[PDB]
Structure 1
């Protein structure tokens, strides 16, 4: 399901999540990749300037809306370190992007938060296909479960 190439991109997402963490933001990174394997756009979380909606997948949906034809959007892939929240999953579906691949699920992150005693997000951790039934979704990647546990702990578990 997750190819070797798919892993390479998820690892790039983990590196963008790390840049975010190192810069004071939350550890989420995301990459948009055309059908050919060329990276079109990369972004990471930027909520530290006060806007909690500054999620990378959202910015990818809007970048694609402005710069890609619908046909090209349907055949592009979004890679993300963490599974799209409902905001990001709906935006993705609204603009007509294609396959999503995630390293860790929002269910896992949900679970990990409570284990540390951290406050739950005000947004439910709904799987992507509850929000967006038509989207092709792959993940998680078992290889990245430990790394993402560590990253998420660095930010949310003290």
Structure 2
């Protein structure tokens, strides 16, 4: 299930990814939403200053650990422009966050990166290989070409 409301959040993730690209970082953005539908926290990739672990899903996991009780974490949704790498999927599950919705799969990105000779040093594992209990929805097919464009701008 990717609802109309889900797609709106995913479109905000894409806007954050573009913000990251325009700032010199890599095009990934993510938002954390409460069960009430209140946006709690938003972030984007910040690796350009030297720390390759500065992925927004990871920032969300640590933010949730600090600011939400486990019960609220479990009922929260994370939206992301790109499917959590294994680092971020593992962090998500460790802190006990709930549903993940992503725009493009890590398989999509890995395929595109392979076309450009830009493969990552971390494997493109689907979230549920890393985090078997997490409910995962995605990809949103309507956002494939849009995200491919941002990825190409960075890695192409």
Return the TM-score normalized by structure 2. Answer: 0.99
Structure 2, unmatched stretches of 5+, are none
> Matched residue of 1:43: which SS?
strand
Shift of 1:115: 1.2
Q: Which sits farther off after the overlay, 108-117 or 47-56? A: 108-117
Aligned length: 156
The CA deviation string for residues 22-52 of structure 1, in whole angstroms up to 9 with x for no partner, is: 0000000000000011000000000001000
State how far apart, in whole Å, the 1-side matches of 2:123 and 2:114 are.
14
C-alpha displacement at 1:93, in angstroms? 0.2
By how many angstroms is 1:92 displaced? 0.2
Give the 3-state SS of the residue equivalent to 1:2 in structure 2: coil
Q: 1:96-153 CA distances to partner (integer Å, 9 max, x unpaired)? A: 000000000000000001112224x000000000000000000000110000010000
For the residues of structure 2 that align with 1:19 and 1:75, how far apart are their CA atoms?
A: 28
Partner of 1:146: 145
- Secondary structure at 1:53's aligned position in 2? coil
Q: How far apart are the structure 2 equivalents of 1:117 and 1:89?
A: 24
SS in 2 for 1:84: coil
Following superposition of structure 1 onto structure 2, how do residues 1-158 of structure 1 map, counting pairs within 5 Å? 1-119=1-119, 121-157=120-156
The CA RMSD measured in Å over matched residues stands at: 0.5
Structure 1 runs of 4+ off > 4 angstroms?
A: none
Q: How far off is 1:70 after superposition?
A: 0.3
